[PDB]
């Protein structure tokens, strides 16, 4: 009695983003803990000098095949900010560019431990009933961190680039 998650097809435009990038290397059982490790790192260092809370926060998975050998693939997840209707922003980082275009947006409503199952539910039991194909691009994690002692009921969104 599996219940399918809510999904939607979105066309996206270019948004100039700024933030901090770094490489990492770990198994993907802790791809949910480490992506929330760096997102705790940059959202609890932007707010600590910010006057204003933005409505959105972006996390961008990028992948770099190292020119030496395609056996290890350098991965880039980056907690980065977007433009809003606020003027005064104190931030650190260099301008990154969202590789926009065609995207598929999964939408989540539930617990903080199920954010792992929002990232665990990727490769096995669901989507080839639609028979999708992923183009080159960046995977995006879309959060809403202003609205969150029980484990929290946060509203998160993935984003996969799918060519049709």
């Amino acid at each position: 009695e599996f219940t399918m998650p809510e999904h939607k097809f979105v066309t996206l435009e270019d948004t100039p983003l700024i933030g901090v990038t770094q490489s990492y290397s770990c198994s993907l059982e802790q791809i949910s803990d480490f992506r929330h490790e760096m997102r705790y790192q940059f959202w609890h260092d932007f707010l600590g000098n910010a006057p204003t809370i933005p409505p959105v926060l972006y996390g961008l998975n990028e992948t770099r095949p190292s020119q030496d050998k395609d056996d290890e693939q350098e991965v880039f997840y980056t907690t980065a900010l977007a433009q809003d209707q606020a003027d005064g922003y104190v931030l650190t980082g260099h301008p990154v560019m969202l590789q926009g275009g065609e995207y598929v947006m999964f939408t989540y409503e539930g617990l903080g431990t199920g954010v792992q199952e929002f990232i665990l539910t990727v490769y096995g039991t669901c989507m080839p009933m639609l028979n999708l194909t992923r183009r080159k691009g960046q995977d995006i994690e879309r959060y809403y961190p202003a609205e969150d002692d029980r484990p929290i009921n946060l509203r998160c969104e993935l984003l996969i680039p799918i060519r049709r």
Binding site: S27, D70, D71, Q73, L120, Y123, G124, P128
Partner: protein, 114 residues
């Protein structure tokens, strides 16, 4: 959805756990059903061999240990069974590969960052 978790554990465990498909059947599902569950996702899983040959190829060029540890470190059966896989994939001798001062991407299968 579910078998995402197989992808980068296999980046981490081509090592000391000798994982065969029946050891890969410890991921929840059966021997035959995990194949097509991996197929329509990726197109290409038993990729594992490539990682074993890619994952052994970190030891030729980037660590100073000689060749006999390599054919048994990353879960291949034997030194000919390694070079049987090496010559089918990279079309070289690994004594003709590492000793060569040049090295490029002809045979080394990429890891799946899907």
């Amino acid at each position: 959805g579910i078998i995402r978790d197989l992808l980068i554990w296999l980046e981490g465990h081509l090592d000391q756990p000798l994982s065969l498909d029946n050891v890969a059947a410890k991921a929840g599902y059966s021997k035959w059903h995990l194949q097509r569950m991996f197929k329509d996702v990726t197109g290409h899983i038993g990729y594992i061999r490539a990682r074993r040959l890619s994952k052994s190829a970190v030891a030729l060029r980037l660590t100073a240990r000689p060749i006999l540890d390599i054919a048994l470190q990353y879960r291949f059966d034997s030194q000919q069974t390694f070079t049987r896989a090496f010559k089918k994939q990279f079309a070289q001798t690994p004594a003709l590969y590492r000793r060569s001062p040049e090295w490029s991407a002809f045979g080394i299968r990429p890891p799946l960052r899907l």
